[PDB]
Design a protein around this motif. Structure first.
Motif, PDB file in Angstrom:
ATOM      1  N   UNK A 132      67.892  41.057  72.902  1.00 58.82           N
ATOM      2  CA  UNK A 132      67.432  42.438  72.884  1.00 58.82           C
ATOM      3  C   UNK A 132      67.737  43.100  71.544  1.00 58.82           C
ATOM      4  N   UNK A 133      67.034  44.204  71.276  1.00 65.99           N
ATOM      5  CA  UNK A 133      67.305  44.926  70.040  1.00 65.99           C
ATOM      6  C   UNK A 133      68.704  45.528  70.038  1.00 65.99           C
ATOM      7  N   UNK A 134      69.243  45.880  71.210  1.00 68.69           N
ATOM      8  CA  UNK A 134      70.622  46.362  71.247  1.00 68.69           C
ATOM      9  C   UNK A 134      71.587  45.283  70.781  1.00 68.69           C
ATOM     10  N   UNK A 135      71.349  44.030  71.183  1.00 67.56           N
ATOM     11  CA  UNK A 135      72.200  42.943  70.714  1.00 67.56           C
ATOM     12  C   UNK A 135      72.080  42.776  69.201  1.00 67.56           C
ATOM     13  N   UNK A 136      70.847  42.806  68.680  1.00 71.64           N
ATOM     14  CA  UNK A 136      70.647  42.664  67.238  1.00 71.64           C
ATOM     15  C   UNK A 136      71.260  43.832  66.461  1.00 71.64           C
TER      16      UNK A 136
ATOM     17  N   UNK B 106      74.860  42.913  66.258  1.00 76.02           N
ATOM     18  CA  UNK B 106      74.974  41.873  65.238  1.00 76.02           C
ATOM     19  C   UNK B 106      74.857  42.453  63.836  1.00 76.02           C
ATOM     20  N   UNK B 107      73.846  43.301  63.613  1.00 76.03           N
ATOM     21  CA  UNK B 107      73.638  43.880  62.287  1.00 76.03           C
ATOM     22  C   UNK B 107      74.835  44.731  61.866  1.00 76.03           C
ATOM     23  N   UNK B 108      75.312  45.602  62.754  1.00 72.51           N
ATOM     24  CA  UNK B 108      76.427  46.457  62.355  1.00 72.51           C
ATOM     25  C   UNK B 108      77.685  45.640  62.097  1.00 72.51           C
TER      26      UNK B 108
END
Ligand SMILES: O=C(CO)[C@@H](O)[C@H](O)[C@H](O)CO
Ligand SMILES: O=C(CO)[C@@H](O)[C@H](O)[C@H](O)CO
Ligand SMILES: O=C(CO)[C@@H](O)[C@H](O)[C@H](O)CO
Ligand SMILES: O=C(CO)[C@@H](O)[C@H](O)[C@H](O)CO
Ligand SMILES: [Mg+2]
Ligand SMILES: [Mg+2]
Ligand SMILES: [Mg+2]
Ligand SMILES: [Mg+2]
Lengths: 284, 283, 283, 283
Positions: free
Chosen positions: B116-120, B123-125
């Motif tokens: 999901x975008x929440x997971x990404x 990951x990004x932060x």
């Protein structure tokens, strides 16, 4: 069993009256000899309706399944025999000619340790009986080797052969899968060679479950070995291109494997037929 | 970071004094430029000792890890930064030049659903924080794509590239593994091509984790792609031939991958050197 | 010159009014951007008719040839220039965009010895002049590398590159052939990589001159190299499937290469298109 | 006849006493079961000397040749029998177990036309006689298929098998060469499969005559086919690495195929034995 097959998952894994019609009709349009029908929810398989469809379209069938966790023969061989004999009953009722697939365990099965002889004793006792049951119904019984991440018991062709020979049944065949062999076999052709005479069924799958001919499977080594050992079994296309996103966790597939199932049916079935012809598979 | 490397797992599970000595001396015996040093039990590492041994034997090092489940960045990004920053400190103390591997998650990580975008976002932060910490240490920070059965987040080179660009740091590189790419890439060379701006590190690993040259990886396609994109990084051998059965569950490996580490080192390092020369990888 | 091409030989090597429309119409039917038109007998070529067809069917063209022995540039460079310049005139008249092929010698050319510097000086003198004539006509000039049995002068990409570099003209490109590279290149992708600054034209031919996809050419390595060097030229199908048996001696082809041209056009052009998509050659 | 062989051309194709010594001792130092001894100048072959060297080093041998043009079987079958029988006499005196190679024609042999029935009648007559002579010496008789540019008569395994079966001798075997198959077979493994009954001898040779494992031959398909048909013959390395520049015209080789014969022997023989063991070729 001999010829070209396509897994029903190219249309769906459901097997209600509508899905069964769509997959069987579609397999006829693509000129396949066999359709591989998955057995997911045994109580909801209408064997009268399916046989009616297979007969209407002139199609031959094999069934396949993965053992649900309550039935994993590694640990629960008695429940394995029950579920496998129940599936075998549906298979023979439908007019299918074999039950194959992960008939010995799961595709998310893991103990954390290498397989133990206690586990293999459970597998051989359980499959001893269900294959005997298949024998009474005229069916052949398949064992599909899968990669190390799905199962810890049968990964290589040599393990599958070893298991068949211990069971000692005369109607069990080894079933190989080029997607799994691409990882498990030290040179994919060595898998086909090891299985040789017990090899009667192939899942022809690209390395990413996409389109055969467009990945990393060394198809010339695969078809060379199949031709050289005199393979006369079934070459069944298996691809996840029609898998809906809800199936993701069950097949460990988190993104699209291809552009769409129609392009996989078109290009992949043609590739398998063209490569079969180049290597004179079935050319006696 | 450029040249030929070997993963320390060819000799040793752990990284105590005597394991560290055997691995570094072994890598030096095979003329390697780099040893890849896994960081598992961070308090049990003697970094000053490792640094002295690297210098004694003229070896360069990269460190690698898999995040333990309490620190998986997709769900616990703050735990991930704390673990990665501690790992980077140890790597810097050892004189390693990078931290790479599965720096964003586990190798038994699975949610049941696509990423999901929440997971990404997590990951990004988290990686942006720790790549920054790496930058203050003078270290580069690698992202290794692994196959779908180990992780649901970074499987193909394009996903790795997408994440690296979302992070936007100048010291992050893409790390590809031919064992994973043999499954994940639609034609293995396509992974190398996709990563051409960021590919600085390779695990050269046969399709069954045995000996490079004796499996299903299409090495001519791999080396052609590396040559054609102008690859300038590290080619590190990864094989499970030395792995004891005690580790079987940690690597999902249930049977021998080869006949022994000694012949994987002999044949596999030679095969990688010989293909690099055939394709003029380093000039 | 960019796109997908097919050699007119898939229909006929003759270029009369009958054969010309049959080939150009056939090339249009298969959605090809280019047809490659051979120039065997220049007086038989009616350029006015050909350009008319090309415009109606929306096809672009490259011309190709093999030098006849009286005009082999290694020995008779002046006769080479005269022959090459006349082909360039006909090529320009019919609206082709390039002259390519074995523009520097024959396909049964050999001396018994390795190629000498004096021969290459002859090659350079001839090609420099004709390439300049080509440049005034707005045509590009191609040099196709062929295998050691057809010619002793330009076999590897490295050789073709060095010859193009010596001549020093802006409109000369390297033309490679997978059938010849399968023998000449130490790993077929190494030829494409070597030619990266000059490669504008490929003959995509199977190892037995049959159907691409059904032989021993390592197509993944070929397309990976093409994509990785950012190839932007023409990919032209070459196959001997339509050659009449009376051509046997001219092409050293003694038995059938496939099951008729229609199958090769169908299967082979589709295969080149699909692999190009797979490796994003043109996007 | 079983095991690993090396062609004496890796040291010399001259067979004076010192060249024979250097070659047989050389094959011994690389642990070979067989050495393949070319028969070119028969009167300079001291058979007693050679046999003694073979037995001293524990080397087995096969002889090989190409018919000289005055004795091409297709056109001059009586002269072919005379030449083959003389070569057979020398082979048996040396202790060799077979005569193989281009035993039916030349490597520059060419009519301009596809092969005719009359030509194959001449081949059948000549080879059936000389194989019958070979049987009286206890030797086997091999037919090596070569590519379309060297010969127009026996190019594919299929053609070789058809000629072997037409002759009907029980001591004639098919001999294949991966260098030639890489061009002639529609999928290299198809040639091995077609020859399965009669295949007793291989030239394991890279696509450019360089080092096996470093070219375009699909070695996994080759060894798979060999394993799957249960091949029990000789795997003989063939490479032009040691060929002197004066040999260029006879082998149509115009530039170096490798960097040196020592590297080819070291890397190439090791590749062959490692693949042989990967595919369990022997036992
Ligand atoms: O490859 C697989 C599972 O890893 C399939 O063959 C599966 O067993 C089949 O879908 C069962 O119906
Ligand atoms: O391929 C892997 C695991 O999938 C390794 O690269 C791992 O990330 C590394 O060993 C961590 O130390
Ligand atoms: O590959 C070849 C011949 O070896 C062709 O490309 C040839 O050069 C062309 O057909 C001449 O017009
Ligand atoms: O491949 C070849 C010929 O092209 C060799 O097998 C040759 O016949 C050898 O030199 C015989 O001595
Ligand atoms: Mg399967
Ligand atoms: Mg790795
Ligand atoms: Mg060409
Ligand atoms: Mg040979």
């Amino acid at each position: 069993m001999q010829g070209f097959g396509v897994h029903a998952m190219m249309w769906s894994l459901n097997w209600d009256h509508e899905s069964a019609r769509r997959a069987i009709a579609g397999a006829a349009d693509y000129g396949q000899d066999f359709i591989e029908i998955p057995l997911v929810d045994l109580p909801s398989v209408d064997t009268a309706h399916t046989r009616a469809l297979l007969e209407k379209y002139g199609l031959r069938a094999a069934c396949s399944l993965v053992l649900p966790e309550p039935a994993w023969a590694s640990v629960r061989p008695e429940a394995a025999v029950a579920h496998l004999n129940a599936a075998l009953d549906k298979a023979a009722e439908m007019g299918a000619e074999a039950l194959t697939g992960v008939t010995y365990g799961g595709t998310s099965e893991r103990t954390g340790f290498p397989p133990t002889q206690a586990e293999y004793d459970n597998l051989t006792r359980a499959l001893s009986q269900s294959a005997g049951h298949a024998k009474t119904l005229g069916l052949q019984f398949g064992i599909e080797a899968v990669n190390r991440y799905e199962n810890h018991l049968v990964n290589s062709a040599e393990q599958a052969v070893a298991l068949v020979e211990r069971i000692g049944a005369d109607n069990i065949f080894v079933h190989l899968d080029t997607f799994h062999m691409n990882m498990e076999e030290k040179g994919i052709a060595n898998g086909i060679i090891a299985a040789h005479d017990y090899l009667k069924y192939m899942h022809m799958s690209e390395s990413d479950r996409g389109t055969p001919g467009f990945g990393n499977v060394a198809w010339d080594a695969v078809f060379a070995a199949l031709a050289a050992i005199g393979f006369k079994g079934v070459l069944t296309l298996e691809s996840f291109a029609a898998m809906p996103e809800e199936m993701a966790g069950a097949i460990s597939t988190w993104r699209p494997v291809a552009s769409g199932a129609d392009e996989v049916l078109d290009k992949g079935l043609a590739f398998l037929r063209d490569k079969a012809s180049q290597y004179r598979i079935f050319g006696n």
